Amino acid sequence: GELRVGLEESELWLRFKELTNEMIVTKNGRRMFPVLKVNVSGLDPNAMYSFLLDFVAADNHRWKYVNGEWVPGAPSCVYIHPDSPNFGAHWMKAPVSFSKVKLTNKLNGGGQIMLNSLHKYEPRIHIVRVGGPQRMITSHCFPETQFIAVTAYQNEEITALKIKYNPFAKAFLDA
Amino acid sequence: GELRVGLEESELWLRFKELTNEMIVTKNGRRMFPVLKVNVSGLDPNAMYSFLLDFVAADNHRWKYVNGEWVPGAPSCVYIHPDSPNFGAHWMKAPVSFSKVKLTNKLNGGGQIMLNSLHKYEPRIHIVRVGGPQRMITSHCFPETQFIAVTAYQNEEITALKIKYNPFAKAFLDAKERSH
DNA sequence: ATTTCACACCTAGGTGTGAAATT
DNA sequence: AATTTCACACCTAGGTGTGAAATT
Ligand code: NA
């Protein structure tokens, strides 16, 4: 196939993956960091597509953080990228960033993807053809972006990188 | 026809309009206030459309504000609404607000609309069918939203209404409510 | 007469913190 | 004790008119 989906900023994602990544989930929705950003080529530049994001279990068991390490102890709803629907040229000319998806531990509203806390999840992206002869769906999972949903950060080394890179955490970037 | 396009918050618009509305233009682009919003019905909920905004000259005069009144003394580039392209159901389920369009006097390529200062303009919206059997471009002009592009507000009565309704001007609101 | 621009002051909201609540 | 919640200080990000200054 012509389609090519690449995870942008993989170096940054692997820095979090190494220490086991954590994404805060809140009742009101919490943005991800790092932000999932995808590079796409191979779409028809003049065809219409919608990008979808959901979250798949990365394993089967509940997780627990004890003594500085992670120990064992259903697919989410889908989020539509706010640029959808759009032509393939739009999706290809710049990386598709899911900067506005919010993760939550309660089904309290729309636009927020509910996650079960202390479980490992893998982001999965779907490219949906809009108005073609037939339905085209492609799935793309990125192992580098696996994480455990938490209500509070467990590994402080993750907290440090979150502070180091998320501009919204700049006030804590003193140390 | 089936299509129906009407202006949201027309009452607010006509408050500026009967004073002679004014829109600041800057080098880096200035958002409009009030924001142009339209209610759409009659579109095919499953067909694809884009919404386009441009500005047509409301007359041939240059304009001048002297002693508390206005006096005599080419269509713009088009702004594509950020929700474009989208299904008719998306356009119809809520007003189409052009809250992010920026008006400038120095066209420097940032997606902003260059206008001529001290000229009178009328927002004009275009609904364009996206990838149908054939073209469909409608146009809708809203006489209520006519305005004069300015580098600085001339009519303080207009400035007061900006301060009263634009929440980004809230810092000046209390002193304005104590006037007259 | 007209345009420019740094500025204070806002809207709007995204961070981790840490005390507290919940279990 | 493990986990969740929440008000908070502190930021990013950027939209206002003001009025002193600059430009014509
Ligand atoms: Na400009």
Numbering used by the authors:
A (entry chain B): 40 to 112, 119 to 220
B (entry chain A): 40 to 112, 119 to 225
Per the authors:
Brachyury is a transcription factor that plays an essential role in tumour growth of the rare bone cancer chordoma and is implicated in other solid tumours. Brachyury (encoded by the TBXT gene, also formerly known as T) is the founding member of the family and was first identified in 19275. The DNA binding domain forms an immunoglobulin-like fold and contacts DNA via an unusual insertion of an α-helix into the minor groove. All T-box proteins recognize a common consensus sequence named the T-box binding element (AGGTGTGAAA) with family member-specific variations found in the preferences for repeats, orientations (inverted or tandem), and spacing of such repeats.
We were able to crystallize the WT human brachyury DNA complex to 2.25 Å resolution using a construct spanning residues 41–224 with a 24-base pair DNA sequence. As for other T-box structures which have been obtained with near-identical DNA sequences, two copies of brachyury bind to the DNA in a 2-fold symmetrical arrangement with a small interface between subunits located towards the N-terminal end of the first β-sheet. The contact area between the two protein subunits is small (in the region of 200 Å2) and the contribution of this interface towards the possible cooperative binding on similarly spaced palindromic sites has been questioned following structures of related T-box binding proteins on the same DNA sequence which do not feature this interface. Unusually, compared to other transcription factor families which recognize sequences via major groove interactions, the final helix is inserted into the minor groove of the DNA with two conserved aromatic side chains F213 and F217 inserting deep into the groove and making contacts with the bases. As has been noted previously, only two direct hydrogen bonds are made between protein and nucleobases, R69 contacting the N7 of the guanine at position 5 of the motif, and the main chain carbonyl of F213 contacting the guanine at position 7 of the motif. The relatively high resolution of our DNA complex structures has allowed us to examine the DNA protein interface in detail including identification of water-mediated interactions. We note that a cluster of water molecules are found in this region in conserved positions when comparing our structure with the TBX3 DNA complex obtained at 1.7 Å resolution. The water network contacts the O4 of thymine at position 6, the guanine O6, and cytosine N4 at position 7. As has been found in previous T-box family DNA structures, the DNA contains some significant distortions from regular B-form geometry, most notably a widening of the minor groove to accommodate the insertion of α-4.
